């Protein structure tokens, strides 16, 4: 009786192009595929069969993409490979049956699906609130500084394309909807960098401005990483830049609150 | 030590008829069940593997069915060539057990036996024994009576029948009866007679001869 | 095609030992698992052994108490089975077979006969059954042990119309068997009919000229 590397379950995400269900025989004794037969079952159906003797791989029309790597079979690797589109529609308890000459075995692996669309909950709740707090704050400096047209001209549009950017981004599972949403966001914050240095200098402006630029191109070259492919493990840079730009804006609001008061 | 049980034991079918042979396992063996046939004086050949998968060069008339515990070998339009023994064998569980075997006899039209008699060889006679042989050739059904008459005195307990297996072209049988006496006994009598009664003989047929005539 | 050939079957004393050879032909021998299956005279089939393609790993039923040892010489294209401490219960026909997964055996050999008796072999006396449009003639292969005897006609040229009988166990515990053939009566004199009895265990080959009696 064959034994396995017992595996409870596996999780796949929207960005898992190719899906792999593990099946490892620990005590395989075969010396040619002729001796071997593998049957993959799902929900009481035979969804993949490899006959070693004829090396005939046979699959239903509903799993046309399914395969195992023959090469690795004799080593104990009877793991199943399928494309994303087939897997998504078929989440459940997969069964692997492997048969030699005089010994057989089977094992069960549950296929689970989870959605964490593009960024992790905490990450995609940051890069939305920092460049909303930021402009909300700019409005305070604009309102206090008024009581240019230009600044208010380019002021409404910034709030609009953050409100647009930050609802284009956050739906779905890593679209070009999101990709563009976030781009509109970083470019909005990227004309905010200009609309914050549109006051008029102290020794306090050249600071907040230069560090705002630093953190900004850190946040753009901090996004040039991320825009490419789902599950980008390059989030902290994008959040930190927008952090310093939020905070620079914060120095902005209150240092001017000091001026417009004290001669 | 799983047990494979086939059913039926024996079977008589008319050619061009469909037939189902059953096989039962003492535990679940999914679709891992194989079917072979054996024609007498041949060795087994594989018909089906993994319950249902047909093999290259198997007539299109055999196919296997079932899964779990109960299985079925179906012959859609059996032929006089398919006379033989069918065995199921479990692909799963230990050990690789075979089934008891299903004998499949072919049914046909009644055929009368060609009857021949052979007096003993002088060679054997010098050896000290006489054996008289009676052949019934190519008949059906299998059952036939033979009585040995020596000067019309009916003999008992000195004869031996042997029956050929069923032909796989003409679905007939053949039968030898050997009458064994010593040189002495044989040389004491004149007339040696074989009396054949068979279904397709309107009257018992006798082959006889007079010693060395 | 594929062809498998067993040899090495014989009469043996109980407790004796036999080594069976199986010649494989017409495929990549070292590519496939192989097996031994015997067939008892009750005509039941019993798997006795199995070897992997590589010869590394072997498998047997608990039925034969570790008395059988399978091997394979991948160079000579020969599969072997060593049967030891033979018992009366081992008397059978031994088949080699090419094994697929689930030990599906898709090629079988013709078989080799193992007989285990306390009896010694006695060879058959062969006698003509002289004929007297169609004539019938034959052979009386009488008083032989153990089984079986093989009978060809005219070196195996004559196959059409030949009925070699099932042997029958006599009062003596010897075997008797006849082989007969129906031929055109026109042929006799102008054609030779010879009856080729081979009884292997007693090293008996009779080639009997079967003739109409003077
Ligand atoms: C999906 O991608 C990750 C990347 O590390 C991988 O670990 C996972 O096993 C992949 N496939 C499945 C079936 O989860
Ligand atoms: C069988 O094996 C070869 C390599 O051994 C493989 O490349 C080929 O595609 C297989 N045959 C079929 C019908 O898939
Ligand atoms: C699979 O089986 C496990 C227990 O064996 C069960 O908890 C689970 O709910 C089943 N189905 C799916 C879809 O995971
Ligand atoms: C299996 O059998 C094939 C038959 O062509 C042989 O060529 C091959 O190398 C053998 N062994 C393995 C492990 O592939």
Numbering used by the authors:
A (entry chain C): 1 to 147, 158 to 210, 216 to 278
B (entry chain L): 1 to 213
C (entry chain H): 1 to 132, 139 to 220
Show sentences the authors wrote.
To facilitate crystallization of CD47 in lipidic mesophases we engineered a construct consisting of the full-length human CD47 (residues 1–305, isoform 1) with a thermostabilized (M7W, H102I, and R106L) apocytochrome b562RIL from Escherichia coli (BRIL)25 fusion protein inserted in the intracellular loop (ICL) 1 of the receptor, namely CD47BRIL. We crystallized and determined the 3.4 Å resolution crystal structure of CD47BRIL in complex with the Fab from the mAb B6H12 (CD47BRIL-B6H12). The crystallographic asymmetric unit contains a dimer of the CD47BRIL-B6H12 assembly, and interactions between the two CD47BRIL-B6H12 units are mediated entirely through the Fab’s from each unit. While most of the CD47 residues from the ECD and TMD were modeled for one chain of the receptor (residues 1–278), residues 211–215 and 279–305, equivalent to ICL2 and CTD respectively, were completely disordered and not visible in the electron density maps. The overall structure of the CD47BRIL-B6H12 complex exhibits an elongated conformation, with the Fab B6H12 recognizing a monomeric CD47 receptor with an epitope on the most apical region of the ECD. The CD47 ECD comprises the known IgV-like fold, and a six-stranded mainly parallel AGFCC’C” β-sheet harboring the binding site of SIRPα, oriented at an ~80° angle with respect to the TMD and to the membrane environment. Electron density demonstrating N-linked glycosylation was identified for all five CD47 glycosylation sites within the ECD (N5, N16, N32, N55, and N93), but only modeled for N16, N32, N55, and N93; N16 is positioned close to the membrane environment in the vicinity of the ECL2 and the inter-domain C15-C245 disulfide bond. The CD47BRIL-B6H12 complex structure reveals the presence of a six-residue linker between the C-terminal end of the ECD and the N-terminal extracellular tip of helix I. This linker is comprised by the conserved sequence motif 114RVVSWF119, and forms an extended loop referred hereafter as the 117SWF119 loop.
Cluster of Differentiation 47 (CD47) is an integral membrane receptor containing a heavily glycosylated N-terminal IgV-like extracellular domain (ECD), a 5-transmembrane (5-TM) spanning helical bundle domain, and a small, C-terminal domain (CTD). CD47 is an essential component of the innate immune system, and binding of the ECD to signal regulatory protein alpha (SIRPα), abundant in myeloid cells and particularly on macrophages, activates a signaling response that inhibits cell phagocytosis (‘don’t eat me’ signal). Tumor cells hijack this signaling mechanism and overexpress CD47 to evade the immune system and enhance survival. In contrast, CD47 is the only known 5-TM receptor member of the immune system, and has a molecular machinery adapted to exert multiple roles in signal transduction across cell membranes.
